[PDB]
Structure 1
């Protein structure tokens, strides 16, 4: 039963959403003082700067393993990076 990658990939493509600007969920893989690694699972676990996750008091409410929601800008950048933005989701909200 060599399940064809064609139909498996079709299943995957209907499983997710790929368009610029789309608000998509993600898993926060790691948190650092500088950037936060998030994963929407497209081509690369992206990294978003820290201030995008800070409140008026400059607090990183977000923790590791939390499911956050960021706006995908481009699925790729020429540098092998998915580009995600939290501030865009903030504007949407």
Structure 2
């Protein structure tokens, strides 16, 4: 996280001072509200944590979607003890092995390396995480 001040604002480009060898440049996409305007001015002390970085402060635009069960896309990449970490829009998800691993009938190797579409019901902005549902198994397994 970096705390900087806005000094130069030329349409489509915002210049923030941090104190390194160069001053960062932030695209207006991070400072734009839901109405279609800006929310800052020259002389304002804003926050900026570094387009593979603007997502950290762009997920705030996906709240109005998770309020009505917004279907998204992700892929498993991490695995521990009964816990699965999925990269959903760049947010680690939680999937217990309650149904993932139980009563093995055959070669259950279709887990590590699967790329389907999952559904979300509840989101946690307090733990910067998004736990996946359970009943949505009827869509991810065989869509």
Same topology, TM > 0.5: yes
**TM-score between the two structures when normalised by the length of structure 2:** 0.44
Does residue 1:71 correspond to 2:119, yes or no?
yes
Structure 1: any 5+ residue segments left out of the alignment?
none
How far apart in 1 are the matches of 2:102 and 2:116? Answer: 15
Q: Larger radius of gyration, structure 1 or 2?
A: 2
Report the CA distance shift for 1:71/1:51 in structure 2 as closer, same or farther (over 3 A).
Answer: same
Shift of 1:37: 0.6
Q: Larger helix proportion, structure 1 or 2?
A: 1
Does residue 1:50 correspond to 2:97, yes or no?
yes
1:88 aligned partner: 135
Report the CA distance shift for 1:78/1:6 in structure 2 as closer, same or farther (over 3 A).
Answer: closer
Number of positions where the alignment pairs a residue of Structure 1 with one of Structure 2: 87
**TM-score between the two structures when normalised by the length of structure 1:** 0.60
How far apart in 2 are the matches of 1:76 and 1:24? Answer: 16
Aligned residues of 2:74 and 2:115 also touching (Cα < 8 A): yes
- Bigger relative CO (Cα 8 Å, ≥ 6 apart): 1
> Could you report, residue by residue, the CA deviation over 1:43-88 in whole angstroms, capped at 9, with x for unpaired residues?
x302211243347636252114x32322212221643321212x32
